[PDB]
Amino acid sequence: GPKFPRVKNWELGSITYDTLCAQSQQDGPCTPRRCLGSLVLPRKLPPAEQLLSQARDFINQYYSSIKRSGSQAHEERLQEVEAEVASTGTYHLRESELVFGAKQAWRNAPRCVGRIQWGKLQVFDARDCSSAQEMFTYICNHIKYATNRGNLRSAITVFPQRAPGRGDFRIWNSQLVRYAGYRQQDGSVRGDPANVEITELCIQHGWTPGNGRFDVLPLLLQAPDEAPELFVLPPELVLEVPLEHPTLEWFAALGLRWYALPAVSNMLLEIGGLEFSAAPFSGWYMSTEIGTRNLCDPHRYNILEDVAVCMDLDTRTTSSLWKDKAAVEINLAVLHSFQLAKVTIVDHHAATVSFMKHLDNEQKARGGCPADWAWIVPPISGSLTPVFHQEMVNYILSPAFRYQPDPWK
Amino acid sequence: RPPEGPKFPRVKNWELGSITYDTLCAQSQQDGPCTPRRCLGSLVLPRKEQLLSQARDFINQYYSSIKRSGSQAHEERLEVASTGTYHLRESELVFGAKQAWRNAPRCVGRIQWGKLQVFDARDCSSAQEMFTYICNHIKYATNRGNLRSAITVFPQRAPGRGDFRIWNSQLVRYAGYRQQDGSVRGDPANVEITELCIQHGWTPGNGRFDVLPLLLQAPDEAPELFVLPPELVLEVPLEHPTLEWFAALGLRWYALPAVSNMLLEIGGLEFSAAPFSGWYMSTEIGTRNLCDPHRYNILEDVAVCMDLDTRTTSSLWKDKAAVEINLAVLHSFQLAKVTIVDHHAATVSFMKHLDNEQKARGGCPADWAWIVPPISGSLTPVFHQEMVNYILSPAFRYQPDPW
Ligand code: HEC
Ligand code: HEC
Ligand SMILES: CCOC(=O)N1CCC(Nc2cc(C)ccn2)CC1
Ligand SMILES: CCOC(=O)N1CCC(Nc2cc(C)ccn2)CC1
Ligand SMILES: CCOC(=O)N1CCC(Nc2cc(C)ccn2)CC1
Ligand SMILES: CCOC(=O)N1CCC(Nc2cc(C)ccn2)CC1
Ligand SMILES: [Zn+2]
């Protein structure tokens, strides 16, 4: 009936219609002829006709959230954003506006299953930062605050925006905490295979390696129109959790571990047409990210076999589900270890349940929620999760967090 | 080296770093549900002269396949005239059926598409005749445990009269008896079909695994009940390799997965009743059929028996229990000598299939959410493979229930 997408939950039988997608101002990669919903990346790599359009949209969005849409303040602010843009080609956001955009960005992130927390975000303004040494100080303050000795707090630090005729502020690392990936002579990799390239760039910019499997990397912080600079994170700020299993004594002997703080640092924060090329954000890990992807992906630590081997499992055949049995124990070890270390973490069952709650909330608040099924469903025990059975509608909303081309090349 | 842009979509594999481009989607003639505004790829069902063309495309396609295109025949072949419709030759039907399966985006078992036994039953005119055909289909495909892929095609649709239909969603499914308190004895998924069977005069059972009778319908007539010969339905008692008490659960499952409620579309013609079968992927039984909250829902029970801590999610009792149930299935089928493939082998073979199809047609339509299995998603190779989804003809599609 309704001229809007009908989404069904196959478990509860319930139905809803998405009206939120109508506000989308950015096109996706799908077409009536073919769905490219599975692709990780759409496919690629500041005027007034178009910037002004995005700014007002954002401004309306903001006045509407404080329930003062169409008021005097609203009208004046609009006039104001046109004034600044016409005489300079760009414009600045108010503090309160920045806090709103940041939270909306997380809120709008289709791939994030932890959005029930979108409201509890600590925004740190660092739009006043003017050097790499300053970027590094903000960053450590961020980590200290977010880590909070185990009781993690979601936070984002927003550095200065882009301005034509000038280089952006950038963090070369994909995360604030990454383990080194050392290419070996035999062609293998010591450390995290994912970070081979960033590890190599650090060594070039004067960093001295170390053949460990979990050596925290330095940060390559870049201030406008200047070569990056190396900064070593003070060990005491980087909280880590050595891994051990609740009943398998040998697990601890594997010498495995992981850091508590998941802080993405390479994405672009876009608000009202403004681009914050450096805006690291952090929350707390969902156990499957560590115990399934980071540790079990063939191209990552790839430990399944090592673990199935201690378990005395028939690794000679797929039908023995050795891979499945091993992955579960590994995921359990991660959960047992964080809880043992009093470091915040959420399992995939709890996360997905709370994500379903988030959907209902969003339905009443915005009439919908952009969600990327393939990312909302956990990497293990997919259908044992409630979100598996939930049909989702994916679209692009702003404010948004987006991908941006790497600094180097 | 690779198209960039939207024309031919680049597809990447994140485990290997390999990249390819899909040129096959250009042959799509049917729009899906996605828009540049919002992707609806996760929905399960569509919100919801032309013929003469759909049927030349098929004929060309068929003639190009036998390496005999643009000749005399193909040309000569390209009834709609004085009838408004037309009929396919048998060899053409076999080719079309094989292609429908080949183009199914949600089937991870497509490595097997060339190996399909096609049964032509377009000459049925009674529910009775459908039954005999179906019985022979089950027998052939089961082949005493060494399962064979098979499809039986019934009379196409004729604009004007009713459709030949098989009311059941599957040729073999277990009855679901509701029984005041509000619980189901059997398969909750089959309450409706069970009730309809009783309504149509079937004497119910009183078991957790009573095989359901078939409700077969010839055009414009009320369906007719038929009871499958017990000797025809090969089942498999479930038990675990080490958990001795598992067999005590008294669980079991049938060996043959035969879909019967879909519509087969070939060259514009629609075959409303075309049951098709293959063999199971262990996780369909062990995860969906047995663990799903609205199916046999044995998850908790098994966890408690295993003495897991079901008080908190964090103990991962659901995860552990699910794996053991999946293993039980694989163990039971192997022990019983009945064909079946685990999600690891099937997806490994599907990856091969993708390579093949790339050399063969420059791509392969695939639905990621369905290719990746319901458990252990990222421990499977397909998880890290990007996929393109679009519709090709021939194709299998949903149709409304006959009631
Ligand atoms: C409160 C704890 C929290 C949890 C648990 C959480 N997030 Fe996210 N999250 C994202 C974005 C953006 C993505 C999508 C990443 C992409 O598209 O590359 C994401 C993705 C994810 C993923 C998917 C990873 C994958 O590859 O499958 C998980 C799991 C996740 N978030 C969990 C922004 C955030 C922000 C930003 C202010 C915060 C805080 C945040 N997320 C907090 C959290
Ligand atoms: C050779 C053994 C074989 C295996 C293993 C196999 N198939 Fe499929 N398969 C389909 C179609 C059509 C679908 C998609 C069903 C839908 O969209 O409702 C499918 C879907 C599936 C699914 C996804 C189920 C889900 O809900 O996640 C699995 C797993 C599968 N097939 C496995 C037609 C076939 C045909 C028909 C000629 C044959 C034979 C066939 N399939 C043989 C096989
Ligand atoms: C596009 C590449 O994305 C990634 O590598 N990742 C996706 C995003 C990220 N995970 C996160 C981030 C947060 C803030 C909390 C929990 N988990 C790190 C892994
Ligand atoms: C752009 C860099 O991208 C990456 O490093 N990755 C991109 C994809 C990433 N995660 C995924 C992928 C899917 C399909 C579902 C959940 N999570 C694995 C690593
Ligand atoms: C749209 C809903 O589809 C289904 O419920 N089903 C369709 C898919 C079916 N599985 C199958 C089918 C075959 C032919 C072989 C192995 N597995 C399970 C039943
Ligand atoms: C229209 C009939 O639908 C159904 O019977 N079902 C609906 C969905 C079906 N399978 C699914 C669903 C997903 C999301 C992925 C793989 N397989 C299982 C039950
Ligand atoms: Zn799509």
UniProtKB/Swiss-Prot annotation, chain A:
Heme b binds at C112, Y403. It comes from the Eukaryota. Zn(2+) binds at C30, C35. L-arginine binds at Q175, W284, Y285, E289, N294. The keyword Zinc applies. Homodimer. Interacts with NOSIP and NOSTRIN. Interacts with HSP90AB1. Forms a complex with ASL, ASS1 and SLC7A1; the complex regulates cell-autonomous L-arginine synthesis and citrulline recycling while channeling extracellular L-arginine to nitric oxide synthesis pathway. Produces nitric oxide (NO) which is implicated in vascular smooth muscle relaxation through a cGMP-mediated signal transduction pathway. NO mediates vascular endothelial growth factor (VEGF)-induced angiogenesis in coronary vessels and promotes blood clotting through the activation of platelets. This is Nitric oxide synthase 3. It comes from Bos taurus. The lineage of its organism: Eukaryota, Metazoa, Chordata, Craniata, Vertebrata. The chain holds residues 67 to 483 of 1205 of the full protein.
